[PDB]
């Protein structure tokens, strides 16, 4: 990790003095569900490129931005465009925004992503509530928490078993019903692996048998950092393709808006 505590402080100060908004919830839009930014009122945008110490997108001319605004009666900050390990960023860079949010006053992080369905019951287009995750990179030591611990953020050995908020999942369901959805609200374990190439048939089977319902190349690192610093976490995976074992983004967007009401404080 090449950031010092003060780097995080400097970026949060710079933001608090360039916007007066004071979000309590942050949201990381996955690939495709980035449209949630529009439909946020009193919008104020910052190019990641101009924020001090912020990682800068790779795809030239596709640089992301941090949008401060009101979603559905709640003050939030959202990431439009994210950083992945396969793009060459170390996790301490990928997850930098999360510790900044915490210092901005945020208390709840909502993560979303487009994933590959491993579970056969999932159909192209469904929404899966993340109840748990499997961190493959972490098994080898690739972890944003690697390095001496920063007490001012969290403890040395952060529990992860309860990473995803119990209450939020219940509410996620309740609020999915009122919507009057015909297709049910899926629920699974998300498995993160490096990328960028997609899985071989042998790997998909192995991951499935490993107990994974969906695969992606993101999110896990953010959640670990979020949980380490004490943020409340909950999030979803938009199954955009089922994996070879041998569009509907809009609904996730509004579903996320409504959810805002369910977040405490």
């Amino acid at each position: 990790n090449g950031y010092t505590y003060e780097d995080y402080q400097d970026t949060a100060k710079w933001l608090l003095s360039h916007t007066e908004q004071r979000p309590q919830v942050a949201v990381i839009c996955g690939s495709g569900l980035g449209g949630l930014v529009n439909k946020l009122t009193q919008a104020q945008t910052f190019d990641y490129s101009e924020i001090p110490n912020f990682p800068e997108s790779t795809v030239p001319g596709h640089a992301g931005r941090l949008v401060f605004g009101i979603l559905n009666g709640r003050a939030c900050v959202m990431m439009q465009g994210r950083f992945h390990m396969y793009e060459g960023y170390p996790f301490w860079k990928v997850t930098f925004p999360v510790r900044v949010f915490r210092l901005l006053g945020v208390e709840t992080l909502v993560v979303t992503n487009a994933a590959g369905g491993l579970n056969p019951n999932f159909e192209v287009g469904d929404i899966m509530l993340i109840r748990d995750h499997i961190n493959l990179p972490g098994f080898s030591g690739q972890n944003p928490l690697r390095g001496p611990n920063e007490e001012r953020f969290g403890v040395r050995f952060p529990a992860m078993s309860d990473a995803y908020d119990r209450d939020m999942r219940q509410k996620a369901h309740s609020t999915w019903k009122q919507m009057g959805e015909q297709r049910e609200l899926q629920e699974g374990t998300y498995v993160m692996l490096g990328g960028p190439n997609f899985e071989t048939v042998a790997e998909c089977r192995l991951l499935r048998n490993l107990g994974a319902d969906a695969v992606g190349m993101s999110t896990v690192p953010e959640v670990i950092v979020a949980r380490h610093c004490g943020l409340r976490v909950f999030g979803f995976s938009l199954i955009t393709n089922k994996v070879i074992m041998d569009q509907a983004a809009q609904k996730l967007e509004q579903f996320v808006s409504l959810l805002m009401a369910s977040i405490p404080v």
Copy 2:
């Protein structure tokens, strides 16, 4: 990745202007399979050391060399000496030759390696056709494609489900009939891990139960990069040992690979 597109190009040009040869198939010989380089005729050799941008071998006294020639009717370029992650090379160096091959005009990459047997039915001396792989290093982000995508080679999110060419696997099985050999041509999933130490009993069991048939510390990186830049891929693992679960065939493999040349399209 510390190579820019032009690096690859400079290397291809240097080779293209230093040899009259114009290979259409590339072969990476596994450990103890370098004998396949003999058998090439009209051969021309280049030490890895003298080639611009080429990684140089680590193992003292094992130079490393690229050999161009005709095998059994087909123009080939061969690697005699391989690079491995356990030697300290990052995958962008291990797989560097592959992209040079593509820029040279190569269209098919043949991979070969010695591996340990996981499948209970496998015997020493068996030849396993690689039908698929499990890239364990890749589960943690160690990947030759990590970093921004170079579109002039291939796409950002390359598919791997069809990595090992289907028409070749069928031609492999049919051609093996003509080998005369008594034992069958095995087939399976090759799992790659880092090494250099061989597996423990719990690891062997664990890998077998994950669906792996053969274990090694190579090949997969090269396959990923080959598929990324559109090369057709087919290969084999010589089972030189049966892993603890609780030579007279390397020549056969060489002759089989020579035979198979005549079965590669165009």
Copy 3:
């Protein structure tokens, strides 16, 4: 790597001239097993920080020292305080002391650690004789032996099938049944992952299915390096907790002291 052979030597020569003791066995004490240093006689101590090329502990106020002496009438060298990958150290540093030991003349390495129980039959306070291990980081290439091989220490492809000495596993059991406890001596597979966060449920379940009986974030690197340079190896995990799938340290200590007599040569 990062150290050359002469480094390991320089460090060995330094320790050799700074103490006349000539240990035959080395002991790496795990978390909480620090107390094995006391109950060692004619002890001579060296702070990690003053010994050439030795890595220095991260934890503030958690110094780190190498202790030479006599344990149960046996000359050995013990590490009070260890090095983990989650602290920021690459394995070529974590395992640096092991090769130094081989150069000192040590012929047997005893590894100790605190671990999480994955095997349902284990109870907190249990002592699990390490029978085998699963090196998860090793699968992705994180390995203290990565880089050109140093032939003066060992071979290119060392075998790991018989890492934990069969004879000591027999003599460990024969000796345990001479201390009497309502609980028998446990035996099993130690799986190592990076850290520093504790496991999720999905991961905990995953690891049990791999055939793991106990999780940790150390030890495996030292064992691999010890077998590579021909040291005899054996060790124990002290189950300090049971993993969630949906008054015992002093024991190990006297147990480890007893086994000294059972060590060959």
Copy 4:
């Protein structure tokens, strides 16, 4: 050596595609001489931070921008804020903008800076036309051209003996007379050293003895990179202090002087 040729192309292409302006001259504005960005007509700005591969400013709250515009009937590209070796940038990042300017089609580089006066006859407010320079970091190898030469920019061993365009210097003197100035236009050698600290007395005498007239911590790397890739170069120093051997006033003069010289720049 940290950038590949394509990195410069990418950066140039991204600029050439975000603006239709096509500068013939680039100007690097010295310390506090940035008011000249005004005077520019049809200005189009781009913060350094947003341009691909561009170094980003260190001093918090000093952003830094590249402005394209017309000065006095002449297409220009100007740097508002610059990079210095003393801030931690290696010379290959400090001079990165100069190569991009060449790729944009710029043919002439105008460089200015604030400098400490070493010549005893200089006074605060003097403007010193740069006739030559002494590159001290260069004597130890810290050089923006270190590394394998990129032939597409220039030759391996470029000459520096004629770095500062003679014609432009004569035109600067003609131009200065036409402005009605009383205090003569000084002219001499600029010596660059690393910094960030100001010199000791023994260092100031030593530098004067090396033939230096003014001292600063910038400009020379850019000049060297500019000559290597063929740009014509002209520059001067605003003497803001007399060095110890034992202002904004001279601003709108500098800006008018630079504006006037635009018309004397060939082609």
Copy 5:
């Protein structure tokens, strides 16, 4: 610079909580002048190797230490063994102790070193009060201040013209009188160059013509950092040799201890 402001803080606090002394002045002893460490009563020592963030000596057998004590009613901290660019350390490590001293409450820095005599009138054994310096490495940018400026220590462009305290220079000559010496107290310009080879004849002549009186491979970096962070400064070179242009260590030692009285505060 690899150190963040807080690294300087952690090192200062540590020293502060490990000793009760509160030095007001610091002394850096040059080659063959570490005897001064003694003469210090109430000596409390710390090996460099054990102080957090401290660089470690290079030459085997010379560990180097930081000693706190009294020199003449004067509470001070001294460096026995210093760091050099020629050894491989970047100037930001060479000068790390100076900023730590400042944070320990030190106000005055005394620097001493051994040097080659360029001034042909100097004689081996002479002591040369340092009046000015020439920082050759600084001409090409090798400077401990390179990098973003840290306001908490000093300004962006610190003056260096009055680096060697004028009053102390006067008290130094005086005090040399009331010490009754047979040789005059020399005073001149110290020029720092990299090393480690000694000068060629052409270099020596060149150096004398730059106005240098004594050449060496240290001190200047330390003085630059001290001045940058507000320390008063003065020092001496002990001319241990005359350079090819075509013993008295105890003295310097007693001279410095005498000067303790004349240091303000």
Copy 6:
């Protein structure tokens, strides 16, 4: 410095076992003076690229090779193609061949280079015996000897005042008479700066007043490494241009060939 003592040993062994020649003199040809290699009899060439640990040339199409052969009855090892700091090599690479030659048994290094004449009396085509040098990069610490000193090669602070052999210089003047050249054997101080650009007028004047007679971008690092490891050294600059202050190669070839006979043992 990235090389360890054993890399040198490894490289020397590889060479000693790949040729039977055992030269006692090494010659480094200047860029442009590479014709000395032709003229060599019973030559055996090794491309730099195949020699373990050797730096490899950057100029594509100009391989660079080490040639072993007989010059004027004397066995030589010759470098055809040289390494320079301006090409990006650190001095520890530039001078790597020099320490290898010592390990091969070489006792004398003949350095050769093309340079710019500073002395107003020099004329193009002059040959200047190098009598002394000024190492500008060394004034700022860029020095092949930077880092821990390898006592197996030499001392910590090697003397440089007698770098260019006294006896070989007299011999060179005698041999020159025998060549009956219109012009005399010039003699002087070689100054080295980094490059790659050539000097401005102000720089030439300064370099000249520094006491330098010729300017180049090489040689000095090799000479320093040479003397540090006890090699005798002598060299010449071929003045190929008079610097702006406001063929003859065959001659240098014959000259060096004649001197082979005058080199000791």
